[PDB]
Nucleic acid binder design. Structure first.
Ligand SMILES: [Mg+2]
Ligand SMILES: [Mg+2]
Length: 398
DNA sequence: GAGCGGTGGTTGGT
DNA sequence: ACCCACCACCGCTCA
């Protein structure tokens, strides 16, 4: 669901997540806020093999990636109207927000975006659009290397594009063609004639009706058996429309989905994005117990992986400049960021992270005390370490 | 969830 | 009777 939708609305725009984050940071002078439907993990994550808890090792690595993009994420969990404990623990340890939707997470993500709690939705598909989403993203994946890209769909362009499908058009598409996950849906009716029904206006109409409907179903089911207005390709005098159609309860579930109370939205308005302050000692205990990153090798490995992320996180909360960045050596506009300008920065991983390997039993190599290098987006560096970027730019004009 | 070929059915037209 | 294009649906396969 909805099967074959992308043939209608398009497959969407592939775009560097770093480009979305940095464009938004430049346009709105604050980091991108993302609602992430926690259901997107189940498929991608079950492929990591080896070690201890690989499904949530890779969740760990995606959280470090979100640290370095400078994205403020709210992770949304499904509720009962229609391991998560480690995960909610790991969310907290990274200073991210966990939110339990009352019902479907997709409906709640979309609601958080139209209330302004978040700027975009990352979900598994475009169901979010029937639920009111405007900017919806899916398929955070390589473009087979690191996951750098998402597929962007825009409700404003879709609705005025070739399909013409808007929220009520789609919604009629799922009422007519969704016979396999919604009751009282027209057998033998698929995406093609549901979509030319939507285009003929029957979705705007049904949606603007008090849950009367009889002067619509008869009007529709006659336009189908005869095609008098030529609203479709062929006649359909054999589509048996069930008497309990349109199931308006199924309509209510899309038009008025079960979302958080008004008071909960106001709570989120004051509390998200909440304070980050990555729990360094908490992540050290977590990785020791869950990944078996034991003793000094496991402390040194946490440092290598976490250090570039804290650099970014600390640059967005922000003389004291030298404490995060020792130098800049180059610039690039690499295609993996859709040409976001990045600066090559030096830093001391163990100095930046705050843990000490020698307080752990010792059991070519990587020294957390020597300088490491990372590519960081130039506009994040102008915010956090501004006079270092001047001197490099003055050095460059020399 | 999403893509793909097979397939069995409907429509409209030989 | 039969062809044909279109389509919905299904099993399969990557998840
Ligand atoms: Mg969904
Ligand atoms: Mg869905």
């Amino acid at each position: 669901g909805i099967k074959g939708i992308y043939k209608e609305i398009g497959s969407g725009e592939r775009i560097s997540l770093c480009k979305l984050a940095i464009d938004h940071l430049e346009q709105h002078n604050r980091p991108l806020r993302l609602a992430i439907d926690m259901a997107i993990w189940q498929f991608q994550i079950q492929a990591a093999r080896g070690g201890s808890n690989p499904a949530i090792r890779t969740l760990f690595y995606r959280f470090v990636r979100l640290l370095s993009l400078g994205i403020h994420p709210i992770f949304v969990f499904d509720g009962p109207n229609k391991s998560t404990a480690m995960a909610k623990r790991l969310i907290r340890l990274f200073g991210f927000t966990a939110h339990d939707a009352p019902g479907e997470a997709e409906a709640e993500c979309a609601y958080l975006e139209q209330q302004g709690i978040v700027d975009a939705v990352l979900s598994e598909d475009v169901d979010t659009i029937m639920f009111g989403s405007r900017v919806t993203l899916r398929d955070w994946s390589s473009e087979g290397g690191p996951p750098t890209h998402v597929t962007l769909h825009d409700a404003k362009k879709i609705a005025e594009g070739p399909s013409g499908l808007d929220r009520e058009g789609m919604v009629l598409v799922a009422l007519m063609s969704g016979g396999d996950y919604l009751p009282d849906g027209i057998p033998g009716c698929g995406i093609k004639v549901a979509c030319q029904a939507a285009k003929a206006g029957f979705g705007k109409e049904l949606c603007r009706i008090k849950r009367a409907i009889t002067e619509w179903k008869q009007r529709l089911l006659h336009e189908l058996r005869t095609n008098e207005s030529g609203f479709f390709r062929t006649k359909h005098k054999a589509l048996e429309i069930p008497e309990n159609f349109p199931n308006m309860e199924v309509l209510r579930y899309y038009t008025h989905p079960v979302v958080s109370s008004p008071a909960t939205i106001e709570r989120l308005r004051q509390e998200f994005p909440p304070s980050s302050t990555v729990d360094i000692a908490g992540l050290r205990e977590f990785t020791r117990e869950t990944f078996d990153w034991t003793f000094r090798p496991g402390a040194i490995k946490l440092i290598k992986v976490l250090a570039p992320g804290l650099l970014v996180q600390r640059c967005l909360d922000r003389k004291e400049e030298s404490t995060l960045v020792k130098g800049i050596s180059m610039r690039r506009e690499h295609f993996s960021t859709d040409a976001t300008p990045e600066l090559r920065v030096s830093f001391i991983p163990a100095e930046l992270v705050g843990l000490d390997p020698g307080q752990e039993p010792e059991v070519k190599p990587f020294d957390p005390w020597q300088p490491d290098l990372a590519w960081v987006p130039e506009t994040i560096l102008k915010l956090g370490v501004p006079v270092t970027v001047e001197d490099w730019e003055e050095g460059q004009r020399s």
